[PDB]
Ligand binder design. Structure first.
Ligand SMILES: [Zn+2]
Ligand SMILES: [Zn+2]
Lengths: 435, 435
């Protein structure tokens, strides 16, 4: 409420949002001997230790993380809460993956005791990997979303989540109705939206599993609550696209289904977007919609390769998602490593600065939270990660041989996993410690 | 005379080599309550605990690894010893990667104290990841191959290694001559080939960096020592293939340069093989040559996707390699994870049985050592790894949630790292235990 916290160490952040990756080098900030002052869970002062140490009264001990690297909390823009335990070994693609693996897994989260246990486990996985803000697919059952929101509220986490809307083309145990989906999402909105740092997303799974009536209910919810988020899947798989064209033949493609139902615009986030024509690229760019780039699940399911270069050209906001469930890791560093491989296959060179930006401030911007999180600017919420770049013998050996900042970022990205995460602070408090 | 060791736990191995990945299930033996008796570094007896417990003498206590999974030691068919510390810039490709990072890194190994230190480090990395047999690229300098062989012989490891032969198209500090290369490789063969379990490989880096004179010297070495190995790189990158076509215009492509110099045949291993014509597939298959599949470096360098399906159709032996240096991990589980993604991109489903097979007995077969290692058949050399498939909370959850054995192998493949390696035995001796 009024007590100060002081953290010294080496910091990396990006001081402003940009519009081309070539700009990132001029917005990146690295302070080897830096100092972060925290009050009321927000950044109070940040800069060089020699310019700010006078502000620390003799009554306070500084959290001394010298030798570590302190970065803003990672931002995961697409992840499924009720899918941590999922294993899909039989090399299925998207639709068979949904019927064989996704739905039976999410069925176990109808139990509220199981949902309660797994919500704590899910949040701990996030913190364990340095993710402090995520845009989260929930369940179809509203009480499991209640459990997830309660677990996140325990630590005053900034999280966007919502109930999945799906009333057709899925097993009976995982279906709602248009009317029930409207009313349950409305109850969750009134209970959790802008409850502390929590935020609600109107979350239809995708167009195949929602009737026109349910799509209208999602449109109605967005009109009644214009400051909520929208979150859905878009053009992940070609068979999915053909299925959509078969189910909505009178619309001008896949994205046009969401557009006609008023589900495009700012803070509307579309996961995957692997197979877009120009109609849809330009629509996303004019409506200022966001994309959740999920390279790992794209690879595992053989969906394809996301065109990050065309996203930069079209001025579309892109953030990174793990798509846990189909993806296998909660870790943002490994996600960026897989993105690097995906882009190398397209001849696109992903710089370390660009990867770091997409992991932090770029993801926050894609979620419309860049005024709240993403760097160490005074006034930002104090979500950050203390990383140990020497946490593994090979990682330490390659870090001991890196002198430049790009070398350090590249080593962190290519060799990093959960062991690289030494401590995680959320709302200015230590909420995870690797020990 | 000699004494026994008893190892109890859960075991899995493949009991014979196959030629179609569909037969692997028929040859996969899983013993849930099993006993492995070791004498003189070899499998004395293997089978069900109740069928063999009577053979355990009163003088020895059994090593009880119940709750773990015991597998044959992993076989790494292409790895570069003097490259563990290499940190590369982002986005650069094979030939520029070679000239900017690979050669200056390998230059530091002229110092023999540094070579000794890194030889110990390299062996430690192999052991802690469960690799008990590797086909290893050495240096151009004979002293570093001496250091590597000394480290491997200290623990009586079975390792194939050799001095790099390269006399052109590289900085002067990393070049030999045809005559010096022949004589240095002959001295290393005379000192180390069949010294204990050690084996020598005639190792020209690739055709671009070897003159016709040096290629003739390598041919001569292979003719004088027909039981040595041959190990080189082949059709990794399209620019590399075009370079080879310039430097040997009178040969019918890349593989034919090696073939005309009599360097194809049994125990000849060609790394990468990403861009093969159908001529070259048939030539590899008729000469019974082997391929080292390295998915991680293929993806980092934008090389392409190895066609494992055509390798099975053409009946060419394939093993897995890390290309440590360009690759970022010593770990075979992660290597198979990357292979799974590469094959998903090609529409090929890599089975858990197939991945496990290529990691153990299939790899030994590609190296021509399947009569000595690769499973728990009586008489085989006792190189094995005790694995902890539940080594992290997420691994434990996904392993519990798996019902079939292929699901458990898949969990290990997608989530496993060095933390999965609990114990490593080489030559019937415990040589690594996780701290
Ligand atoms: Zn998803
Ligand atoms: Zn190599």
């Amino acid at each position: 409420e009024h007590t100060l916290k002081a953290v010294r160490g080496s910091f990396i952040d990006v001081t402003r949002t940009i519009d081309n990756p070539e700009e990132i080098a001029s917005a990146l900030r690295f302070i080897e001997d830096g100092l972060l002052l925290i009050k009321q869970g927000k950044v109070e002062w940040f800069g060089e230790w020699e310019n700010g140490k006078h502000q620390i009264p003799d009554t306070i001990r500084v959290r001394d993380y010298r030798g570590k690297l302190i970065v803003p909390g990672f931002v995961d823009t697409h992840i499924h809460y009720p899918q941590s335990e999922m294993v899909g070994a039989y090399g299925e693609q998207l639709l068979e993956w949904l019927n064989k693996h996704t739905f039976p897994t999410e069925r176990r989260y109808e139990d509220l005791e199981y949902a309660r246990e797994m919500s704590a486990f899910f949040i701990k996985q996030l913190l364990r990997n340095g993710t402090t803000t995520a845009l989260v697919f929930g369940t179809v059952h509203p009480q499991s979303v209640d459990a997830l929101f309660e677990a996140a509220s325990h630590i005053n986490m900034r999280m966007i989540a919502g109930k999945v809307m799906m009333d057709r083309n899925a097993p009976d145990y995982l279906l709602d109705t248009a009317e029930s989906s409207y009313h349950q999402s409305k109850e969750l909105i009134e209970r959790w939206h802008k409850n502390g740092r929590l935020l609600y997303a109107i979350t239809p799974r995708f167009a195949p599993t929602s009737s026109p009536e349910q799509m209208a209910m999602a449109q109605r919810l967005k009109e009644e609550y214009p400051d909520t988020w929208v979150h859905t899947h878009l053009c992940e798989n070609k068979d999915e696209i053909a299925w959509v064209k078969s189910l909505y033949p009178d619309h001008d493609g896949y994205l046009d289904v969401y557009h006609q139902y008023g589900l495009t615009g700012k803070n509307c986030v579309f996961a995957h977007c692997v197979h877009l024509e120009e109609k849809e690229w330009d629509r996303l760019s004019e409506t200022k919609s966001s994309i959740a780039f999920c390279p790992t699940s794209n690879l595992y399911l053989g969906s394809g390769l996301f065109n990050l270069k065309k996203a930069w050209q079209k001025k579309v906001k892109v953030g990174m998602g793990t798509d846990i469930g189909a993806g296998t890791t909660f870790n943002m560093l490994q996600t960026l490593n897989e993105a690097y491989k995906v882009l190398q296959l397209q001849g696109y060179r992903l710089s370390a600065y660009e990867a770091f930006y997409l992991a932090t401030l770029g993801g926050a911007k894609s979620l419309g939270l860049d005024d709240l999180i993403g760097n160490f600017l005074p006034g930002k919420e104090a979500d950050f990660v203390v990383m140990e770049p020497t946490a593994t013998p090979l990682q330490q050996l390659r870090y001991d041989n890196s002198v430049s900042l790009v070398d350090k970022l590249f080593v962190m990205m290519t060799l990093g996993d959960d062991r690289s995460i030494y401590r995680t602070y959320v709302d200015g408090r230590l909420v995870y410690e690797r020990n």
